[PDB]
Amino acid sequence: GTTPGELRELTDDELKDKLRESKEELFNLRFQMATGQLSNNRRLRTVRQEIARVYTVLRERELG
Amino acid sequence: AAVCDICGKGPGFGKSVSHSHRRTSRRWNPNIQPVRAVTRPGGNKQRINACTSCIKAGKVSRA
Amino acid sequence: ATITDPRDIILAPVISEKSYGLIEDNVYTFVVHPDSNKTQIKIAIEKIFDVKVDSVNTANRQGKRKRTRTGFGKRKSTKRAIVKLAAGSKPIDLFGA
RNA sequence: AGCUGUCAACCGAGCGUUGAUCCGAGGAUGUCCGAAUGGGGAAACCCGGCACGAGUGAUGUCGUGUCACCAGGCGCUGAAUAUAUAGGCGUCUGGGGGGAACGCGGGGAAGUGAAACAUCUCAGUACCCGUAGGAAGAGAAAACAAAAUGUGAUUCCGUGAGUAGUGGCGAGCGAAAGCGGAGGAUGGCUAAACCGUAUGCAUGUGAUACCGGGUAGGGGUUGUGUGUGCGGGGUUGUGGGACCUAUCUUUCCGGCUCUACCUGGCUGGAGGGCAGUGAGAAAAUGUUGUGGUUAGCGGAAAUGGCUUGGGAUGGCCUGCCGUAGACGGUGAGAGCCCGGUACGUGAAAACCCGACGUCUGUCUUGAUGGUGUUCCCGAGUAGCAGCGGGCCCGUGGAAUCUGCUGUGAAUCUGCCGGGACCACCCGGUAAGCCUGAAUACUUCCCAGUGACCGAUAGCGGAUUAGUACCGUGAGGGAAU
RNA sequence: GAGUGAGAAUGCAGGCAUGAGUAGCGAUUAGGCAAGUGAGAACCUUGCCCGCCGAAAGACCAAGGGUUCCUGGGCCAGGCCAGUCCGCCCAGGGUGAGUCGGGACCUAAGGCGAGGCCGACAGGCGUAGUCGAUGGACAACGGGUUGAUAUUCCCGUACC
RNA sequence: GCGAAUUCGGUGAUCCUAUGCUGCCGAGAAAAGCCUCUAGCGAGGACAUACACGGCCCGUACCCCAAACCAACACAGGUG
Ligand SMILES: [Mg+2]
Ligand SMILES: [Mg+2]
Ligand SMILES: [Mg+2]
Ligand SMILES: [Mg+2]
Ligand SMILES: [Mg+2]
Ligand SMILES: [Mg+2]
Ligand SMILES: [Mg+2]
Ligand SMILES: [Mg+2]
Ligand SMILES: [Mg+2]
Ligand SMILES: [Mg+2]
Ligand SMILES: [Mg+2]
Ligand SMILES: [Mg+2]
Ligand SMILES: [Mg+2]
Ligand SMILES: [Mg+2]
Ligand SMILES: [Mg+2]
Ligand SMILES: [Mg+2]
Ligand SMILES: [Mg+2]
Ligand SMILES: [Mg+2]
Ligand SMILES: [Mg+2]
Ligand SMILES: [Mg+2]
Ligand SMILES: [Mg+2]
Ligand SMILES: [Mg+2]
Ligand SMILES: [Mg+2]
Ligand SMILES: [Mg+2]
Ligand SMILES: [Mg+2]
Ligand SMILES: [Mg+2]
Ligand SMILES: [Mg+2]
Ligand SMILES: [Mg+2]
Ligand SMILES: [Mg+2]
Ligand SMILES: [Mg+2]
Ligand SMILES: [Mg+2]
Ligand SMILES: [Mg+2]
Ligand SMILES: [Mg+2]
Ligand SMILES: [Mg+2]
Ligand SMILES: [Mg+2]
Ligand SMILES: [Mg+2]
Ligand SMILES: [Mg+2]
Ligand SMILES: [Mg+2]
Ligand SMILES: [Mg+2]
Ligand SMILES: [Mg+2]
Ligand SMILES: [Mg+2]
Ligand SMILES: [Mg+2]
Ligand SMILES: [Mg+2]
Ligand SMILES: [Mg+2]
Ligand SMILES: [Mg+2]
Ligand SMILES: [Mg+2]
Ligand SMILES: [Mg+2]
Ligand SMILES: [Mg+2]
Ligand SMILES: [Mg+2]
Ligand SMILES: [Mg+2]
Ligand SMILES: [Mg+2]
Ligand SMILES: [Mg+2]
Ligand SMILES: [Mg+2]
Ligand SMILES: [Mg+2]
Ligand SMILES: [Mg+2]
Ligand SMILES: [Mg+2]
Ligand SMILES: [Mg+2]
Ligand SMILES: [Mg+2]
Ligand SMILES: [Mg+2]
Ligand SMILES: [Mg+2]
Ligand SMILES: [Mg+2]
Ligand SMILES: [Mg+2]
Ligand SMILES: [Mg+2]
Ligand SMILES: [Mg+2]
Ligand SMILES: [Mg+2]
Ligand SMILES: [Mg+2]
Ligand SMILES: [Mg+2]
Ligand SMILES: [Mg+2]
Ligand SMILES: [Mg+2]
Ligand SMILES: [Mg+2]
Ligand SMILES: [Mg+2]
Ligand SMILES: [Zn+2]
């Protein structure tokens, strides 16, 4: 839900915070999907792609 | 024992032909002898295989 | 830079008659990563839900071979952790009861 | 301007002019196995060391790195054993495996044919082994030729020619010279003899020594001898090179040239020349080019009438475009309905090309042809012999080339070849090395074409296809 | 210009006849009745009998198989008949270990094998090693529980 | 849900003591493990108590003299 653009003003530690918050979110809605009370399915994909985006930006910061 | 350790002279392959011109494959092997030569003037000896051509030409010092 | 957090290990809860019957005795079944061990699972479960975990028992289940006009295919091979919580009995309520 | 690959749709949700799906380029992530390489293993699954973090009350546990073996550089150490070596420790840099065909170097059948069969053939084939490259190999005369004041590195193609030959003169096999062409680079570089240097090994006459010389002084390139490296110098066939031998002497000056005076080389610097990613030593790098490749975009002209029809893209009649009447699709034969075609336009980035500069190197302390000798011109090599291989040539009178074994020279009034051999003539200059083009092939990608097949055909495979299935396994292998 | 003409190759493929509604329907135990279910019952469910095994035709494993196990549903193909049933079809579920059986312990026959030696090359053996149980070492017992696991879960008491 | 009595004997192993004992020739694995000794490491350390903990990976369903394995079959055969 957040463009990779506005992830470049965030430092390493707060990018890491964003990433762990997102991983916790993903665990929660994975449980909700398993128990049957998640109707919105595209939420899983968006959060999974957000995690991938956060790693991508971190690696780009490391290398250049 | 058919490769020289110095010049790599290996066997050659040809035919042994009988009186009935009955050719069979055989090998001309090199005349490699077990030499035990020195690399240093001092005289420490290491055992190798050297064809008699290399012995004759003095490529190995059996000091 | 990878970050490893506990939730990357446990994937789904097992929602079944037997799983609920164990829940009623304060024992929780999860689907876990196929390459985990009981020590890692215990640490992760204690770190996520903030409980004391007594025991973890693991089972490996092979995938069901299903037929088709093409032939056979196979499902995932999964492994499950049955986790027994301490006597304090602070329930875990992400299962729906 | 619609999208969430597909079989293969249904449900459940969503995204999209704030530019999604899609396409091209460069990147990131990239579990496990596999050369597989921390150790092990029944490939894809088991067990670790060390370092830095994480996490726990602590052990447990997690994350990221790193840890195979060989070969070669460099540094340290130098067993038995003294010199020392073999080895050991460390730090680097490579190697390993795969691949359809084409290349090169080796090993090498049998069925078969000979109307039997053994020489011979098949056939240097099939297969195997070692190695490549984008091509390879070959390549710059120790060649041909034949008395012509002749050709001139190699490779390939056509002939010569099924000829000369060869052959249990059986079945069979089978040239080259010459001649016509594709290409061009009749291309390059070393060794040696001498000169200088540096170092190593045996040495001092330890003293009148070396130095181009005369003068004077000191008194050691150890005097010397030798081997190796580096640089000059040379690079040849009418032989050439070196050593001394001769006239005119041409970019500036300085330093060296045992020492200082004048003279002989070597060396610096500013020139200028000439070349270069080349075979002729390489490397790095800028700048440019409406050069190419990897997505695309535009692109003229019929809603035409009448009629049959479910539907015109049929029939009849009208217009129109055409640098476009290629080919498809659209409800039946469409140049004017769609995609396109002819024809133009387009690249941020990456890659492949040239071109101009930095850069790199060389040449100029210097040129030229003469006049007369000594040295040099690739050594366990050539040649010779024995036993083989291969040449059209099956041992023949058997040259040329070549392997194993034995013996074993000369440096040019030499040595090799010209089908035994000898003499004379002619051609050439082995035992050192590089080398483009013309030639062979297609795993893969792009674009096309077919008097090619059209579902028992064409690939085994138009569909689950190397699938199902059969076999312990190599392997065999459908039908739709 | 031809992949140009079939009736024969114990020819190849496919479809279909003849035998023929014929043989067979796979042991040496053997079934019956009442009721139920259901469209349909010799074959399924329940009861009561009868019979067979009983050093097994019972109970538990290894190897091998691979979901065949349990629950719900099904009845086209398979079952040598029918089938409401099924080891068959479909969906969901089910396998819990410090002590069991292995590894993380150890080696045997053997395998591979750093360096190694041998061999034209391809390779052959092999040292140190390192794997390799069919063996050696090593700590848990009784009861209960599920439709489906049980020295594993729970209960009681232990041991390393 | 509640739940009685459970005492004496006889017989008796192919199972245990037993990796024993006795005979015999055919002359009957290895390694770890354990115990022990020193080399060595060493300023702390040994036994005990109590409490709190960690105990890893793989198999475990079902068949298994069988219509579930080897036999093309729901096969009169085979299977420790
Ligand atoms: Mg050898
Ligand atoms: Mg030969
Ligand atoms: Mg022969
Ligand atoms: Mg990652
Ligand atoms: Mg337990
Ligand atoms: Mg387990
Ligand atoms: Mg099924
Ligand atoms: Mg894209
Ligand atoms: Mg890409
Ligand atoms: Mg490994
Ligand atoms: Mg290995
Ligand atoms: Mg080294
Ligand atoms: Mg020494
Ligand atoms: Mg290779
Ligand atoms: Mg023959
Ligand atoms: Mg014959
Ligand atoms: Mg015949
Ligand atoms: Mg070419
Ligand atoms: Mg070449
Ligand atoms: Mg010819
Ligand atoms: Mg021949
Ligand atoms: Mg020189
Ligand atoms: Mg030179
Ligand atoms: Mg001449
Ligand atoms: Mg367009
Ligand atoms: Mg009409
Ligand atoms: Mg018309
Ligand atoms: Mg048409
Ligand atoms: Mg057309
Ligand atoms: Mg010469
Ligand atoms: Mg011959
Ligand atoms: Mg001859
Ligand atoms: Mg060459
Ligand atoms: Mg076909
Ligand atoms: Mg047809
Ligand atoms: Mg076929
Ligand atoms: Mg098979
Ligand atoms: Mg025909
Ligand atoms: Mg016919
Ligand atoms: Mg017929
Ligand atoms: Mg037939
Ligand atoms: Mg009939
Ligand atoms: Mg009859
Ligand atoms: Mg009858
Ligand atoms: Mg009958
Ligand atoms: Mg029967
Ligand atoms: Mg009845
Ligand atoms: Mg009886
Ligand atoms: Mg009995
Ligand atoms: Mg039984
Ligand atoms: Mg059943
Ligand atoms: Mg049926
Ligand atoms: Mg039936
Ligand atoms: Mg039923
Ligand atoms: Mg059933
Ligand atoms: Mg334990
Ligand atoms: Mg062994
Ligand atoms: Mg080796
Ligand atoms: Mg071996
Ligand atoms: Mg082991
Ligand atoms: Mg065992
Ligand atoms: Mg059971
Ligand atoms: Mg029990
Ligand atoms: Mg199993
Ligand atoms: Mg079990
Ligand atoms: Mg069981
Ligand atoms: Mg079993
Ligand atoms: Mg039966
Ligand atoms: Mg069967
Ligand atoms: Mg049977
Ligand atoms: Mg038996
Ligand atoms: Zn030799």
CSV table of N, CA, C and O (backbone and C1' of nucleotides) and ligand atoms in Angstrom, one decimal, chain E residues 3-6, ligand 38:
chain,number,residue,atom,x,y,z
E,3,G,P,7.2,-38.6,-55.3
E,3,G,O5',6.8,-39.7,-54.2
E,3,G,C5',7.1,-41.1,-54.5
E,3,G,C4',6.2,-42.0,-53.7
E,3,G,C3',4.7,-41.9,-54.1
E,3,G,O3',4.1,-43.1,-54.0
E,3,G,C1',5.0,-41.4,-51.8
E,4,U,P,4.0,-44.1,-55.2
E,4,U,O5',2.9,-43.5,-56.1
E,4,U,C5',1.6,-43.2,-55.6
E,4,U,C4',0.6,-43.3,-56.6
E,4,U,C3',0.4,-44.6,-57.3
E,4,U,O3',-0.3,-45.5,-56.6
E,4,U,C1',0.2,-42.8,-58.9
E,5,G,P,0.4,-47.0,-56.4
E,5,G,O5',-0.9,-47.9,-56.2
E,5,G,C5',-2.2,-47.4,-55.7
E,5,G,C4',-3.4,-47.9,-56.5
E,5,G,C3',-3.5,-49.4,-56.6
E,5,G,O3',-4.8,-49.8,-56.6
E,5,G,C1',-3.5,-48.4,-58.7
E,6,A,P,-5.5,-50.3,-55.3
E,6,A,O5',-4.8,-51.7,-55.0
E,6,A,C5',-4.7,-52.7,-56.0
E,6,A,C4',-4.6,-54.1,-55.3
E,6,A,C3',-5.4,-54.2,-54.0
E,6,A,O3',-5.8,-55.6,-54.0
E,6,A,C1',-3.1,-54.7,-53.7
G,38,MG,MG,2.0,-47.1,-53.4
